Amino acid sequence: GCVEVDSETEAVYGMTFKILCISCKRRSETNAETFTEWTFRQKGTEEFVKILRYENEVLQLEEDERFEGRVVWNGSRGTKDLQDLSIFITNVTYNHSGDYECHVYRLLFFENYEHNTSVVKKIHIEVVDKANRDMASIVSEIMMYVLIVVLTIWLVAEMIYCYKKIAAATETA
């Protein structure tokens, strides 16, 4: 089934980056109808500029040249119930640094009832030049090696301890 996963908040210059915005329904059997709208503010700016809106299946992009020609849809295909509004940036720049907002205008469908809900996903990314491996991964690898080392040290310690003990017991006769 669907799963809402948070986007990655660290792009890298001159590369590609897919901004995740996944907003699934409370019941997947429902025949919803969704389109999306993206608003973006750069770093150190008081605004929220609409950049690209994906309607039923057409993706038309705004007049913003900060994204003109370097962004493509990376979400659900040919469904009309999108449930996955993920945008892909090709050739990430320094101006792709700020808070994005993912508008999800999900109009559901029932027997004689048509709900109109809206969930907003806000994603903040900061572009760098070199991909910094995350401190959780680095401490996990360091702790893996530390645990391997301390375990083998405990092993060899008890090994030589018992060994010379039983050698003193062996040469008792």
């Binding site: 996944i22 059997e29 996955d84």
Partner: protein, 1138 residues
């Protein structure tokens, strides 16, 4: 004078035979449901011969005495009631026409008196129920206690409905509820999940859920299933929990209660099933078997040219070798008929035909040869010779002459019984059924007939009066009591434990009082009495320098150190738990994802170090001559393979990705460590050879049944379902595939689809027979078989309708007999093992064994020193008033009244009733604390020396603290769930009831004694469930959701997988769970989906691994159910005798 002719015609074989034939003709006539007009005078002749028998016997016996010697035996009260009711219904009678017509049904119980022996065997039945008394008392006690638990926990929860949010015309919930009554109007305001008659339940907890976007959960309307599935009142809770105890459709109550109240009530259902349902079913079995076996053992203790031809042929038949020759011919003919299926090339078809005719020519030649060799009289002398004669005749009737014609070749296979000793045992028991306990099978047939015709006479008019309650097409349902055949089908389906789905319909159409009466009588007398006698009967019948050496020494010391062993146990637990977290929600929690990916390398390294240490410490000989070490070595090698693959890179390639899913077998390293699981594995390993023998016998039994079923139902399950609604086309238009395809290219939404568990080949036939014999999924196959017409023909509703007897025969033999045979042989093997092992139990470790011995040590024969009376005389009179039996029984009656005032609660009670019940409860609590505190004032130094006294103290304490905590909740906080779970504390006051009820305290002690072996079996079952749940989360996550798999129940996470697996442990709903897996190959699927939030593609599962997974799990669960069954039987025997 004519008194002599009366007695001399009374005592007479042909007289008894004519009355027997007359009442069998009566039983033939009682199944008409609408007898013709010419039958009134023949019913008069029936009444006349009955009254003639009656006056004959009264002339013989009484002679104007008052029918003393004729009514001193009650078996003639039956006859007298029959004749008087017949006379009063013949003359003027009241308007209850059907309710008085049905009274003539004891003309069928007259058979019990007419036929000899049946009197004695119904005497045995009524002697068995007299011992079933106490087990039924305890059954209703536990059912009511768990009904109170379920009441306090889910009162009204099944009313939760996802109600709209945007209400028009200033309407509100009440204003629309008192307005709408049609189900389409209900649908316009609630959710109503696309087809179900009842509105979907929702929940306020985060896990239960999940009301869709625009709907808010609120409890308004009627409970599901017409209002009968509910916990609102104590009556409906007792009905739903009897439903749980007999495991009748309990899977749907499971799903509904979890969806409404939360997924964390799987705890309630686990406790209810694995104590109430299992323990009580097997306690009924234990007591029935005990009474049966005790009464059973108390019972026991060209003439020359012709003779030259004869000599030549009798010499060339060469007895010791032509036997094996035609035996291998029989086996190849079996396996040659078994390769017939609906999708067939004409080459395979004519190959089968020529092979079959060649084999039957061989058979005929050999049989006639030896017949005229050894003297047709001497030939017909023998049963196997006459059987082969019959078989060759039924074969040659296919010389130049429909599949029932050919499908009587199948029973050749029994010819193997002369060489097969296990098949000899099976032949023995199958013939014994029609022989020695032909009486019991006849009593069962008579009871089923009587209940069929009673149910018909009562309810078949209402069913037709308007089905429009239980149907929207206003036609009869599948299981209706309108005809005798269908009444019998319902009684059969209630003998199998499936009473509730038909009881709902019958209640709706014809009154809850009569329907509960009839169905409860059917259910009890069949299942809990007679169909238990058969299994108890099978059970009883099967009863009867050299630095290297010091290096190895220190390595051995370190390896077998208890510290090292516990360290490896802890690491096994950690490495197995590290598998619960890798589900579809693992693209989130990336920190724990990376932590686990590195912990898996750490675990690989630790276990490789342990393997190398065990090598250096034991030697390759001692290592590779140990199955546990072999299993650990195999798992460690697979771990090292996947580790070096993922480390060297270039590794996401096919086979190694599949090897990665074998990480699910990592928990298997816990068997070697936990001796609780190890002893149950040893018991199963000891029992597996006899299992294999009887399993081959039953596989070839089912192969006979499956080849018959394939000949009957090859390709006759294809129907034109209309994909939107799921409704078979009306068969007036589109009567066949050639019209279905014209429909499919003139319209877009019709799909000529099979059933995916059918009799299309022998493998699918084995699967369908597994479903029919488990009773979980059998109904779709039964419906499609009885609708079948031909191969490429649209089915017609009950066009056959008599393949129901194929299924009835298959149940009664292949399912009923063979599963009871499994049980019998497995109990015999477990008892062989229990005797081989010095007379010790075989499911408990030795620490557990001494625990269990010191536990049963409480079965004291000695009355303990009561207590020393105090010298202070006022405390002494308090002492005697406390100790007297009057005081004891007064406390017992007060406890019963507390139980009653808990029962009286219900959903939607008024505030005045709620508060008066509050005050009755508080005064109950006050008087309970008063009695406990004054007996404490009496026995200050000696009270707490008794378990029941300390339990009384504990329950009064927990009740007072629960009610004061409800007060403090009111004052301080808000928590309804915690409020209810704290209110649950007052049930201890009623659980105090078993203090004085000895006939149930004994069985409670039996269950307590069985608890250790049950804990070992539960350890093993939980490890098997863990392995299967990890396999599920890996494979069956992302399957399409259908039947058993939905949002609440699926293998997407560990919680969902373990709840599905606990549902399957009782075999419940395994067909529904397997049905979404079994589909691939669109339009059953989309093999390249996206699944937003994960890289996985496609939303179906591999049918091979799906069938293997589910069949193997239900079989392993069956074997561990047998294990727990043996635990229950053994400990019941122990507590009874000791």
């Amino acid at each position: 004078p004519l008194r002599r002719i009366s007695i001399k015609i009374l005592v007479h074989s042909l007289f008894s035979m004519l009355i027997m034939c007359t009442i069998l003709t009566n039983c033939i006539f009682m199944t008409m449901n609408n007898p013709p007009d010419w039958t009134k005078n023949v019913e008069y002749t029936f009444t006349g011969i009955y009254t003639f028998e009656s006056l004959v016997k009264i002339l013989a016996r009484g002679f104007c005495v008052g029918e003393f010697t004729f009514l001193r035996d009650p078996w003639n009260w039956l006859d007298f009631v029959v004749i008087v009711f017949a006379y009063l219904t013949e003359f003027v009678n009241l308007g209850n026409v059907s309710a008085l017509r049905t009274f003539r049904v004891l003309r069928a119980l007259k058979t019990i008196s007419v036929i000899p022996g049946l009197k004695t065997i119904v005497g045995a039945l009524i002697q068995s129920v007299k011992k079933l008394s106490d087990v039924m008392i305890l059954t209703v006690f536990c059912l009511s206690v768990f009904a109170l638990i379920g009441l306090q926990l889910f009162m009204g929860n099944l009313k939760h409905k996802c109600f709209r949010n945007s209400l028009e015309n200033n309407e509100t919930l009440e204003s629309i509820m008192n307005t709408l009554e049609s189900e389409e109007d209900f649908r316009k305001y609630f959710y109503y999940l696309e087809g179900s008659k009842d509105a979907l339940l929702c929940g306020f907890s985060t896990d239960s859920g999940q009301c869709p976007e625009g709907y808010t959960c609120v409890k308004i309307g009627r409970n599901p299933d017409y209002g009968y599935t509910s916990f609102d009142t104590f009556s409906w809770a007792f009905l739903a929990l009897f439903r749980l105890m007999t495991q009748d459709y309990w899977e749907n109550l499971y799903q509904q209660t979890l969806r409404a109240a939360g997924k964390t009530y799987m705890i309630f259902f686990v406790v209810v099933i694995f104590l109430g349902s299992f323990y009580l079913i097997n306690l009924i079995l234990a007591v029935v078997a005990m009474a049966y076996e005790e009464q059973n053992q108390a019972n026991i203790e060209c003439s020359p040219y012709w003779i030259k031809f004869k000599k030549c042929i009798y010499f060339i038949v060469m007895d010791p070798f032509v036997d094996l020759a035609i035996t291998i011919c029989i086996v190849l003919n079996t396996l040659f008929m078994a390769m017939e299926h609906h999708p067939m090339t004409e080459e395979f078809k004519n190959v089968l035909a020529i092979g079959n005719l060649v084999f039957t020519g061989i058979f005929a030649a050999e049989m006639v040869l030896k017949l005229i060799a050894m003297d047709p009289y001497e030939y017909f002398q023998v049963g196997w010779n006459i059987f082969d004669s019959l078989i060759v005749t039924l074969s040659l009737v296919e010389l130049f002459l429909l599949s029932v014609l050919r499908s009587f070749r199948l029973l050749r296979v029994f010819k193997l019984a002369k060489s097969w000793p296990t098949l000899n045992m099976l032949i023995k028991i199958i013939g014994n059924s029609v022989g020695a306990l032909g009486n019991l099978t006849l009593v069962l047939a008579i009871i089923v007939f009587i209940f069929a015709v009673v149910g018909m006479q009562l309810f078949g008019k209402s069913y037709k009066e308007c089905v429009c309650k239980i149907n929207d097409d206003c036609t009869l349902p599948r299981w209706h009591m309108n005809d005798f055949f269908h009444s019998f089908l319902i009684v059969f389906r209630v003998l199998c434990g499936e009473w509730i789905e038909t009881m709902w319909d019958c209640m709706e159409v014809a009154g809850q009082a009569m329907c509960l009466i009839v169905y409860m009588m059917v259910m009890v007398i069949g299942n809990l009495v007679v169909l238990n006698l058969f299994l108890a009967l099978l059970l009883s019948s099967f009863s009867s320098g050299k630095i290297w050496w010091n290096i190895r020494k220190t390595c051995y010391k370190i390896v077998e150190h208890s510290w090292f062993e516990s360290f490896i146990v802890l690491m096994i637990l950690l490495s197995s738990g590290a598998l619960a977290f890798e589900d579809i929600y693992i693209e989130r929690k990336k920190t724990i994802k990376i932590i686990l990916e590195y912990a898996d390398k750490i675990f690989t390294y630790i276990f490789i170090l342990e393997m190398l240490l065990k090598w250096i410490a034991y030697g390759y000989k001692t290592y590779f001559t140990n199955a546990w070490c072999w299993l650990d070595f195999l798992i460690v090698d697979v771990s090292l393979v996947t580790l070096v693959a993922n480390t060297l890179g270039y590794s996401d390639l096919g086979p190694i990705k599949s090897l990665r899913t074998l990480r699910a077998l990592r928990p298997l390293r816990a068997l070697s460590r936990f001796e609780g699981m190890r002893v149950v594995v040893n018991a199963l390993i000891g029992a597996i050879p006899s299992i294999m023998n009887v399993l081959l016998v039953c596989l070839i039994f089912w192969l006979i049944f499956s080849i018959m079923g394939v000949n009957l139902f090859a390709g006759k399950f294809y129907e034109c379902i209309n994909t939107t609604d799921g409704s078979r086309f009306p068969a007036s238009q589109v009567p066949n595939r050639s019209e279905c395809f014209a429909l499919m290219n003139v319209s877009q939404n019709v799909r000529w689809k099979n059933l995916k568990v059918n009799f299309d080949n022998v493998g699918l036939g084995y699967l369908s027979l597994l479903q029919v014999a488990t009773f979980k999924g059998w109904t779709i196959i039964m419906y499609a078989a009885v609708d079948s017409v031909n191969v490429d023909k649209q089915p017609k509703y009950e066009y056959s309708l008599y393949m129901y007897i194929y299924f009835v025969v298959f149940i009664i033999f292949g399912s009923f007999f063979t599963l009871n045979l499994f049980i019998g042989v497995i109990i015999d093997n477990f008892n062989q093992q229990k005797k081989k092992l010095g007379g010790q139990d075989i499911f408990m470790t030795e620490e557990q064994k001494k625990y269990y011995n010191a536990m049963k040590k409480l079965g004291s024969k000695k009355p303990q020193k009561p207590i020393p009376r105090p010298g202070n005389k006022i405390q002494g009179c308090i002492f005697d008033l406390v100790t007297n039996q009057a005081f004891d029984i007064s406390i017992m009656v007060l406890i019963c009244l507390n139980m009653v005032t808990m029962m009286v609660e219900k959903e939607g009670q008024s505030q005045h009733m709620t508060e008066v019940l509050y005050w009755i409860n508080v005064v109950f609590i006050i008087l309970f604390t008063g009695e406990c505190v004054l007996k404490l004032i009496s026995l200050r130094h000696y009270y707490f020396t008794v378990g029941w006294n300390i339990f009384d103290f504990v329950v009064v304490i927990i009740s007072i603290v629960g009610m004061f905590l409800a007060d403090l909740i009111e004052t301080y906080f808000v928590s309804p769930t915690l409020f209810r779970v704290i209110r649950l504390a007052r049930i201890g006051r009623i659980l105090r009831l078993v203090k004085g009820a000895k006939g149930i305290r004994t069985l409670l002690f039996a269950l307590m004694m069985s608890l250790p072996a049950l804990f070992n079996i539960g350890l093993l079952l939980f490890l098997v469930m863990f392995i299967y749940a990890i396999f599920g989360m890996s494979n069956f996550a992302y399957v399409k959701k259908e039947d058993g798999i939905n949002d609440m129940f699926n293998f997407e996470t560990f919680g969902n997988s373990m709840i599905c697996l606990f549902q399957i442990t009782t075999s419940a709903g395994w067909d529904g769970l397997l049905a979404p897996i079994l589909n691939s190959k669109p339009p059953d699927c989309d093999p390249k989906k996206v699944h937003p939030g994960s890289s996985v593609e496609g939303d179906c599962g591999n049918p091979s691994v799906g069938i293997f997974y589910f069949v193997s799990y239900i079989i392993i669960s069956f074997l561990v159910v047998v294990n727990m069954y043996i635990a229950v039987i053994l400990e019941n025997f122990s507590v009874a005798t000791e």
